[PDB]
From a paper:
Both constructs crystallised in the same P6522 hexagonal spacegroup with the p18mAUG1 crystals diffracting to a slightly higher resolution of 2.8 Å and the structure refined to an R-factor and Free R-factor of 25.6 and 26.4% respectively. There is no additional density for residues 249 to 259 that constitute the additional N-terminal sequence difference between [name] and AUG2. Quantitative mobility assays revealed that a fragment containing [name] to residue 355 of p18 retained potent restriction of [name], comparable to full-length p18.
To minimize genomic damage, p22/p18 interrupts virus-like particle function by interaction with [name]. The structure comprises an all α-helical domain related to that observed in the CA-[name] of the yeast Ty3 retrotransposon, ARC proteins, and orthoretroviruses.
Author numbering:
A (entry chain A): 261 to 350
B (entry chain B): 261 to 351
The structure:
Amino acid sequence: SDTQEANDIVTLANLQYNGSTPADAFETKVTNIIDRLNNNGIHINNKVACQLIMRGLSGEYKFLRYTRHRHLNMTVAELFLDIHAIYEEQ
Amino acid sequence: SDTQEANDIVTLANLQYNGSTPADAFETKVTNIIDRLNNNGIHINNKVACQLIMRGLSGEYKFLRYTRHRHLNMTVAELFLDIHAIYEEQQ
């Protein structure tokens, strides 16, 4: 709609995942936001994307934010493989 | 700073102004965020910028979000002139 970008930016900047939602849904939710913002000329590269996903990653997913440092050049895909790996083990 | 963009995006997406802070400070705060994001290759145009400023605009400033509709092509500068106008009169 007229208000889509500002709604994606606010969703992205206030993400909260602890493993209640399926990882499948949480992934395509975040991936779609990054495509929509990118096609609207708001470029959120893998670094800043991953920073925002890992913020408000909580519960048994918290620890991904501490390793994340040794993980520079980490893609969103790579970060979700981890979120998936953790989810399947619950 | 390695973490600047994600910090500006989170600040911008959670703005709250009711007229406690001087408009001067609230303006340069928001303007700086949009420059810093733009110099980091993240362009927030006037439309999306104004939408995010007007969200969490509250108190005697709320009403700017209801008019804002008839105000298409509205710049951030234009929106702050209003915030300033209201602030000088609260004082």
